[PDB]
């Protein structure tokens, strides 16, 4: 049983966006659907809920002016419409069924409110200048979030640290490290794999001794 949520949104300040949420395994008509906001590094905030059986929705007063929750029981889909977007609306929005003894939570839909342009990362290999060895890759100059990083296509997952991106001049940069036994590399190949869903790109960068 899940709540499936619509895809990431990048939208201009002042515009509107409408997010959608569709259960797999149950009907919204039989329950209540809630929306919950979380700004980057901040706490959970209950926006509101709807009963799709009678059309009644209820809101936190902080959100009632710009947020509107609707539902369509013929497509089993609930919606959250946000108007007059500002940077304070950049957040993850969770669709949830919150009841007295049980919850179901969606994975969340990210909304970025920005005029900046979508751009793929450059990915650079990080090999030592000269028991265990640490390697890395630098993922530079992409927009918007997120990227996902793996090593050897998921086969190396121990010893990995992928650092939160930092924002500069409308571009993000992150790095990822991996640590392997010194006899593993460079005899065996180590590759970081970087996906950027906004640009429909992936990059596989092999770490090569300099």
């Amino acid at each position: 049983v899940q709540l499936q949520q619509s895809g990431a949104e990048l939208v201009k300040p002042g515009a509107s966006v409408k997010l959608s949420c569709t259960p797999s395994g149950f009907n919204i008509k039989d329950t209540y659907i809630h929306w919950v906001k979380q700004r980057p590094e901040q706490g959970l905030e209950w926006i509101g809920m709807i009963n799709p059986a009678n059309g009644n929705s209820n809101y936190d007063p902080k959100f009632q002016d710009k947020a509107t929750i609707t539902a369509d029981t013929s497509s089993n889909t609930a919606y959250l419409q946000l108007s007059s977007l500002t940077s304070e609306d950049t957040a993850v929005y969770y669709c949830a069924e919150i009841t007295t003894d049980f919850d179901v939570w969606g994975a969340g839909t990210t909304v970025t409110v920005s005029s900046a342009k979508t751009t793929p990362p450059s990915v650079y290999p990080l090999a030592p200048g000269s028991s265990m060895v640490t390697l890395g890759c630098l993922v530079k100059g992409y927009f918007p979030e997120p990227v996902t990083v793996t090593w050897n296509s998921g086969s190396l997952s121990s010893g990995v640290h992928t650092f939160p991106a930092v924002l500069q001049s409308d571009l993000y940069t992150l790095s990822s490290s991996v640590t392997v036994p010194s006899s593993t590399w460079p005899s065996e190949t180590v590759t970081c794999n970087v996906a950027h869903p906004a640009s429909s790109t992936k990059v596989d960068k092999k770490i090569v001794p300099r």
Partner: protein, 217 residues
């Protein structure tokens, strides 16, 4: 709104020991003897997960080291004995009266033995140089506690501009933290100097851990 105020806002507690987190409501969340109060755990990068419902009932599949107690406006979550995988932010939430508000949140840190970082330094790649830029990267990995200081030097001189730092959340397995420090420079300026140094100072020693390279080598 019914306002839910958590305390403390953060704490660090040793493995094997008891952690207790408090939630205070601005008015009662009870009706007919039931307290309409949830507790949620939120791990790094994940949605929140329901732990406790009706203030004191354990959600199916949650371990029994989590318990809740209290009534009306005063509630507690206790985790005992604390495990490493319990590193997370915890929220109370009420469903007595709309809006169904969440508490302010409590960040729980697992206390472990001090551990010095493993420091590694990386010159710009040729790919990045070929494309016109130069970033020097320093990893400071698997250390505890989280507080750490990094200083960059170019030919012996301290450089503060163009440095950006990022920290991981606490590791779920070993309870350490890691940090990355990136010094960004024009390629011109990079090729203008020779020795590049990353120095880490952590409470585990009064001597910095110093990693270095020379561009012309």
């Amino acid at each position: 709104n019914i306002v839910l105020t958590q305390s403390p806002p953060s704490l660090a507690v040793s493995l094997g020991q008891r952690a207790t987190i408090s939630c205070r409501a601005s008015e009662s969340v009870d009706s007919y003897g039931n307290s309409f109060l949830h507790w949620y755990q939120q791990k790094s990068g994940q949605p929140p997960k329901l732990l406790i419902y009706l203030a004191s009932n354990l959600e199916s599949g949650v371990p029994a080291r989590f318990s809740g107690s209290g009534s009306r406006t005063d509630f507690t979550l206790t985790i005992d004995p604390l495990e490493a995988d319990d590193a997370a932010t915890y929220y109370c939430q009420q469903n007595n009266e709309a809006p169904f508000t969440f508490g302010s949140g409590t960040k729980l840190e697992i206390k472990r033995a001090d551990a010095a970082p493993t420091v590694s330094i990386f010159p710009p790649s040729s790919e990045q140089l070929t494309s016109g830029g130069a970033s020097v990267v320093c990893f400071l990995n698997n250390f505890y506690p989280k507080d750490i200081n990094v200083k960059w030097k170019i030919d012996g001189s301290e450089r503060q501009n163009g440095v950006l730092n990022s920290w991981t959340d606490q590791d779920s397995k070993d309870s350490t933290y890691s940090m990355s420090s990136t010094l960004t420079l024009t390629k011109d300026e990079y090729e203008r100097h020779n020795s590049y140094t990353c120095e880490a100072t952590h409470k585990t020693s009064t001597s910095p851990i110093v990693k270095s390279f020379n561009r012309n080598e």
